[PDB]
Amino acid sequence: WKEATLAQSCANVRALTYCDLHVIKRDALQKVLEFYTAFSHSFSRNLILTY
Amino acid sequence: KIAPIRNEQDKVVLFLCTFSDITAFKQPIEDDSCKGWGKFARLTRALTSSRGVLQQLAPSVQKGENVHKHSRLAEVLQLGSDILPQYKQEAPKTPPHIILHY
Amino acid sequence: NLRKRIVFRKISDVKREEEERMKRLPPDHPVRRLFQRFRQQKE
Amino acid sequence: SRGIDTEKVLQICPKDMRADICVHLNRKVFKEHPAFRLASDGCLRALAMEF
Amino acid sequence: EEQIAEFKEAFSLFDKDGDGTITTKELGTVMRSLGQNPTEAELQDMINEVDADGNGTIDFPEFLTMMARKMKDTDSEEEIREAFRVFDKDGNGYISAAELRHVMTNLGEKLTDEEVDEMIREADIDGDGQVNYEEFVQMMTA
Known part of the structure; x- marks a missing residue:
């Protein structure tokens, strides 16, 4: 939502355990966010990434 | 406490640290406080990890x-037992005298 | 029409407000600034 | 998997019950991550569809 | 203020006497366990200065006031908390349209009822009608 430009991956991420993950596509996330602008501001200011 | 961890390739890859509070048992120290007794009480209430x-x-x-x-x-x-697998990802072990059915 | 909506009040809420008024600011400058901002936005 | 056709079950399911199913399936992240503690039900449903 | 609720465990642990208040015997026991040896007069007049009642029975408000004095919370956050507490006529942590209208009328910054509903829905982001602390802070941000 901030950069708006796709970028290449700088590193590699690999599994060591049986893991369950939930994934979200950039475009649909952006569309839902821009529809719900009100939640968008709170989501942007609360959300922090791990890496 | 510090404990570096070896690797399955006999290398060493990781350092492990542990920490614990001893404030309620060491000498009292306060740079600035509302009161000395209040600072003592606050430090003792911070020492709950040891106090548990x-x-x-x-x-x-x-x-x-x-x-x-x-x-x-x-x-x-x-x-030391936790350091055993040495970064290796591997299948778990099974007891002896019980033989694999397959 | 789903785009429009109606405003209303509850009888219980009105009674609560009335009895609260029956039971019934200089430091409030920040919230007053927010009130002025809301008035300007509604203007 | 064997005989489970999860996609077939989803498309058989009607839109609102689909919303409820995916909300149930993503309940984990929804409750545990604080960024969603503020969301509205509609955006929660749309994100559940996306996830 | 409400963040001090976590102190209940420490209060229970320190109240080794179990009488709902501190005791000189329990204080001496924990003192001996930890190995230090301050003076009996020192512990006695510390108890006297701390406890509001002063008669040995150290109640919760003594430690509450000590923590409040030590905290020196930020002026902005304290103002926000006070504003929420006074807008919430019930003080339970909930802001309603009726409470907002009442506090606006009392403070004289009254607005038309449509404006009150509009202000409620500005803060309302989850859409269930409630207004909470972070919604209040987001409104304060301008």
Whole structure:
């Protein structure tokens, strides 16, 4: 939502355990966010990434 | 406490640290405080990690520091078994005298 | 029409407000600034 | 998997019950991550569809 | 203020006497356990200065006031908390349209009822009608 430009991956991420993950596509996330602008501001200011 | 961890390739890859508070038992120190007794109470309430199950029997005894250090140190000394797999990802073991069915 | 909506008041809420008024600011400058901002936005 | 056709079950399911199913399936992240503690039900449903 | 609720465990642990208040015997026991030896007069007049009642029975408000004095919370956050507490006529941590209208009328910054509903829905982001602390802070941000 901030950069708006796709970028290449700088590193590699690999599994060591049986893991369950939930994934979200950039475009649909952006569309839902821009529809719900009100939640968008709170989501942007609360959300922090791990890496 | 510090413990670096070896690797299945006999290399060493990781450092492991552990920490614990001893504020309620060491000498009182305060750079700035509302009161000395208040700072003492706040430090003791911060020392809850030690004050918990690791030393819950302390109020029933006196001069407990002679054994509290060893009691705290045992739970960290147990980490030697945790260091065993040496970064390796591998299948778990099964008991002997019970043979694989397949 | 789903785009429009109606405003209303509850009888219980009105009674609560009335009895609260029956039971019934200089430091409030920040919230008063927010009130002025809301008035300007509604203007 | 064997005989489970999860996609077939989803498309058989009607839109609102689909919303409820995916909300149930993503309940984990929804409750545990604080960024969603503020969300509205509609955006929660849309994100559940996306996830 | 409400963040001090976590102190209940420390209060229970320190109240080794179990009488709902501190005791000199329990204080001496924990003192002996930890190995230090401050003076009996020192502990006695510390108890006297701390406890509001002063008669040995150290109640919760003594430690509460000590923590409040030590905290020196930020002026902005304290103002926000006070504003929420006074807007919430019930003080339970909830802001309603009726409470907002009442506090606006009392403070004289009254607005038309449509404006009150509009202000409620500005803060309302989850859409269930409630207004909470972070919603209040987001409104304060301008």
